[PDB]
């Protein structure tokens, strides 16, 4: 593989970062959402509204049906598709085809709302209908002779880069800080503390790892559990100093508009445990990442029931290394994460963990 050829291989902002993938014989080009929060390679199989193209299995001579379907259901929506096998080519990075599993969607509800498929890059554990259905990245690692590592940069806050097989040095400056993967399903990592404008929230660190704290390129916003979300909102409102935001701004039902004072809004830092448990490092997002333009703006953080989801709101500030080989997630500040001549993210450390508990995951 060539890692330089994978630079700028993603398009979009916004509406998701998608990779160009060629499927079947002869190849059919599809636009595929890069999703580190799921583990199925699934594409559109029928026309549908809101999509331009789709994978026609009947036009691929190499396509083979497994003779079973898969139904995936989420909170908001769902889909059902035929499970098959076919040859796939990633032109930006590789020059050979790979045999992989593929789900071809024949029906869905609230799923397709520029991409026409999803590339699940999480672990075998989450694959449906079971973990025996070999994931795309497991097929690629084996068949392409690449290390069990990929890294992602989002430049939409300018597309992005998915480097399959390693780390590209030109995509970051400064040090990479690694946090352990606590559980291999989603990219679950341990959050120790949340800090708003220098002030730590007064919560038990178990509140941040509710069911799980995960790094998910397929989630748009920084999703926080309700209690944590309420604490962040209160801390942002207190630290802002200017006349107060609407409740509709916090809940996402109303936009806040200006003809904007970035200096008046606080920084949001997330502390992650280092591979050495005595130390931690923080990933910091400036106001420009969580007060998102739509000049009118929407709030880039939302509540959740289960899971603290480190979505695109945060990932747009950092080059994120999914080091599956060494069971860790790396973070470095993105040079492309710059708005109006100001770096919109920071990374720093080390910091002591002697106050907090040794295991914040329940």
């Amino acid at each position: 593989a060539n890692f330089l050829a994978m630079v700028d291989n993603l398009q979009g902002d916004g509406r998701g970062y998608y990779l160009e993938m060629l499927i079947g014989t002869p190849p059919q080009k599809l636009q595929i959402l890069v999703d580190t929060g799921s583990s199925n390679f699934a594409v559109a199989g029928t026309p549908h509204s809101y999509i331009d193209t789709y994978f026609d299995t009947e036009r691929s001579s190499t396509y083979r049906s497994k003779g079973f379907d898969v139904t995936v259901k989420y909170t908001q929506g769902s889909w059902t598709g035929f499970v098959g096998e076919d040859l796939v080519t990633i032109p930006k990075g590789f020059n050979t085809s790979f045999l992989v599993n593929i789900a071809t969607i024949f029906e869905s509800e609230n799923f397709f709302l520029k991409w026409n498929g999803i590339l699940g890059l999480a672990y075998a554990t989450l694959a449906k209908p079971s973990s025996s259905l070999e994931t795309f990245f497991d097929s690629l690692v084996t068949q392409a002779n690449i290390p069990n590592v990929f890294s992602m940069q989002m430049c939409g806050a300018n597309g992005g880069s998915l480097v399959l097989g390693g780390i590209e040095p030109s995509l970051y400056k400064g040090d990479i800080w690694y946090t352990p993967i606590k559980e291999e399903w989603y990219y679950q990592i341990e959050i120790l503390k949340l800090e708003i404008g220098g002030q730590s929230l007064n919560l038990d660190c178990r509140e941040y790892n509710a069911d799980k704290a995960i790094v998910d390129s397929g989630t748009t916003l920084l999703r926080l559990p309700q209690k944590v979300f309420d604490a962040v909102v209160e801390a942002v409102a207190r630290a802002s100093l200017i006349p107060e935001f609407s409740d509709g701004f916090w809940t996402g039902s109303q936009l806040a508009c200006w003809t904007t004072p970035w200096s008046y809004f606080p920084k949001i830092s997330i502390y992650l445990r280092d591979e050495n448990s005595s130390r931690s490092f923080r990933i910091t997002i400036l106001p420009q990442l969580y007060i998102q333009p739509m000049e009118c703006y929407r709030f880039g953080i939302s509540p959740s029931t289960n899971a603290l989801v480190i979505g695109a709101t945060v990932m747009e500030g950092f080059y994120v290394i999914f080091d599956r080989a060494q069971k860790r997630v790396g973070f470095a500040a993105s040079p492309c994460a710059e708005i109006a001549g100001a770096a919109v993210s920071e990374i720093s450390g080390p910091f002591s963990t002697e106050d907090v508990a040794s295991n914040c995951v329940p």
């Epitope: 497994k66 096998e85 045999l99 599993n101 025996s132 259905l133 070999e134 994931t135 497991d138």
Partner: nanobody
Framework: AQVQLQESGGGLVQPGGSLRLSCAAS????????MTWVRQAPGKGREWVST????????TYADSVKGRFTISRDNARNTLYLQMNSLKPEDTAVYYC?????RGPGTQVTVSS
């Protein structure tokens, strides 16, 4: 799913010799699983050998083994095979099966004059 794999059929052969590797599978629906052979020698990089689709019709090979090695499977017997012909000293490695991120312990192939 506990994907269990056990390879057999390796050995010490001369240059131009032959082996038939096999791999027994259990704990999953072998007839629906993509199967892959990989090789690994000490001090060298991991090398993909060949992949076979679940029904056996689709097969792919590395350029280093093309025309010499043949991959196949018997889904009724839950067994993957690698027929190895025209063996060279550079084919010396542990050969192992992989499926869905799991692998077998492998079987040693040694080619020496």
């Amino acid at each position: 799913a506990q994907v269990q794999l056990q390879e057999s059929g390796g050995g010490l052969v001369q240059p131009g010799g032959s082996l038939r590797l096999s791999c027994a599978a259990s704990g999953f629906t072998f007839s629906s699983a993509i199967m892959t052979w990989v090789r690994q020698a000490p001090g060298k990089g991991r090398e993909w050998v060949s992949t076979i689709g679940s029904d056996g019709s689709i097969t792919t090979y590395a350029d280093s083994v093309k025309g010499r090695f043949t991959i196949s499977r018997d889904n009724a017997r839950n067994t993957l095979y690698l027929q190895m012909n025209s063996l060279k000293p550079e084919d010396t490695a542990v050969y192992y099966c992989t499926s869905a991120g799991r692998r077998g312990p492998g079987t040693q192939v040694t080619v020496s004059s």
